[PDB]
């Protein structure tokens, strides 16, 4: 089992998340309350080959994704909405997931994670033109 993004992450920064919300409609009490909890923000992460699983925590909250790269699987966009997700390599150390809403119209919604050469994990969500940035270390 050599280094891969596999390990425990704890955020160091974060970048737009505020914005990214407020584009997805959140309001601004619940943005506020919402950049003080992602300053908890926790990842863990067991990657075997293709195959990923994913635990995002803060204090109160915890969720769990398994996928494979190349097959869709169900999960939700950063504000609660049911999706269809696909994730696809970009190079050694990135993937990018396109989302698709199960139900409704909403802006579009996609997130990328990338290891860089330095042993940081750097997780991009995008919505419609605004990109959230959060930069994690090993725990
Ligand atoms: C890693 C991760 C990111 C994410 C960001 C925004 C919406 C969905 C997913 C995740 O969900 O892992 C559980």
């Given at each position: 089992?050599?280094?891969?993004?596999?390990?425990?992450?704890?955020?160091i920064?974060?970048?737009?998340?505020?914005?990214?919300?407020?584009?997805?409609?959140?309001?601004?009490?619940?943005?506020?309350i919402?950049?003080?909890?992602?300053?908890?923000?926790?990842?863990?992460?067991?990657?075997?080959?293709?195959?990923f699983?994913?635990?995002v925590?803060?204090?109160?909250?915890?969720?769990?994704?398994?996928?494979?790269?190349?097959?869709?699987?169900?999960?939700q966009?950063?504000?609660?909405?049911?999706?269809?997700?696909?994730?696809?390599?970009?190079?050694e150390?990135?993937?990018?997931?396109?989302?698709?809403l199960?139900?409704?119209?909403?802006?579009?919604?996609?997130?990328?994670?990338?290891?860089?050469?330095?042993?940081?994990?750097?997780?991009?969500?995008?919505?419609?033109?605004?990109?959230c940035?959060?930069?994690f270390?090993?725990?």
């Amino acid at each position: 089992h050599m280094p891969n993004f596999s390990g425990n992450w704890k955020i160091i920064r974060s970048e737009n998340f505020e914005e990214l919300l407020k584009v997805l409609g959140v309001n601004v009490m619940l943005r506020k309350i919402a950049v003080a909890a992602a300053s908890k923000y926790a990842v863990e992460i067991k990657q075997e080959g293709d195959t990923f699983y994913i635990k995002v925590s803060t204090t109160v909250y915890t969720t769990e994704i398994n996928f494979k790269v190349g097959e869709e699987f169900e999960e939700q966009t950063v504000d609660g909405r049911p999706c269809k997700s696909l994730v696809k390599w970009e190079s050694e150390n990135k993937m990018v997931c396109e989302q698709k809403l199960l139900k409704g119209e909403g802006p579009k919604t996609s997130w990328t994670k990338e290891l860089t050469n330095d042993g940081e994990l750097i997780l991009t969500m995008t919505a419609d033109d605004v990109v959230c940035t959060q930069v994690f270390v090993r725990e």
